[PDB]
Amino acid sequence: MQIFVKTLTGKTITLEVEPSDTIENVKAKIQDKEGIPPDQQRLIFAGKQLEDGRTLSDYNIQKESTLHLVLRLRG
Amino acid sequence: DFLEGITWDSVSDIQSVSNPSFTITDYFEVVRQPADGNCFYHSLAELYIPNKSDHAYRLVKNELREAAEKYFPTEPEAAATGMRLDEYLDTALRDNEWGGSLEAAMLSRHLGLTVVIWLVDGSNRVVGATRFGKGSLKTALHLLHSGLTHFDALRLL
Ligand SMILES: [Ca+2]
Ligand SMILES: [Ca+2]
Ligand SMILES: [Ca+2]
């Protein structure tokens, strides 16, 4: 499954995943590719926050679904 | 009607995202606020508090304590942090503590405001934007995120 992750800058990361994979695993994939630690990343699908201990099939995320990586802004 | 022509994708109940393409200086006036660590609140105090002062930011931080008591337990960006209300207020109400996305969400709820954070590239071109609230953008509070480290106020021109 080629899911897309959308960021605030508009950057898009295509991840190869399996429906059984957990959000924690998806966060670990993004960490290895972009260096963003999983504690600092909010995955969001259809306006809802995704919990680490749950799977993609539970949130009904499919082949070309696009999640959102929303980062904490401080200044 | 460009800013109104901007389309926002909902990533929370109170939060939306967008990928706009424009230079913030063409549509906004930048009011630079000091690099004291309290500029998020300094940039909000310029746009919201009618009486301008070097200590108007404190009034914004005090309004934030009421807002955190009301909404921090139920805020999505607060579920990520391992912090609970009393820790957050001690950390956040301190001087040189950086405010931003989490603080803007609770303030938008408690003050009935729509807050838009525009992010720039070092040439004043927007790399992205976040809006807290779904109100009109001509009544919203406009904040500039220069780098990922600084906040200045924006007034519509
Ligand atoms: Ca001021
Ligand atoms: Ca009040
Ligand atoms: Ca962009």
Swiss-Prot record, chain A:
Record annotation: effect of changing R74K: No effect on ADP-ribosylation
Modified residues (Phosphoserine): S65
Membrane topology: Peripheral membrane protein
Post-translational modification, as annotated: Phosphorylated at Ser-65 by PINK1 during mitophagy. Phosphorylated ubiquitin specifically binds and activates parkin (PRKN), triggering mitophagy. Phosphorylation does not affect E1-mediated E2 charging of ubiquitin but affects discharging of E2 enzymes to form polyubiquitin chains. It also affects deubiquitination by deubiquitinase enzymes such as USP30.
Ranges of residues in domain Ubiquitin-like: 1-75
Function field: Exists either covalently attached to another protein, or free (unanchored). When covalently bound, it is conjugated to target proteins via an isopeptide bond either as a monomer (monoubiquitin), a polymer linked via different Lys residues of the ubiquitin (polyubiquitin chains) or a linear polymer linked via the initiator Met of the ubiquitin (linear polyubiquitin chains).
Protein name as catalogued: Ubiquitin
Organism: Homo sapiens
Gene: UBB
Residues included from the entire protein: 1 to 75 of 229
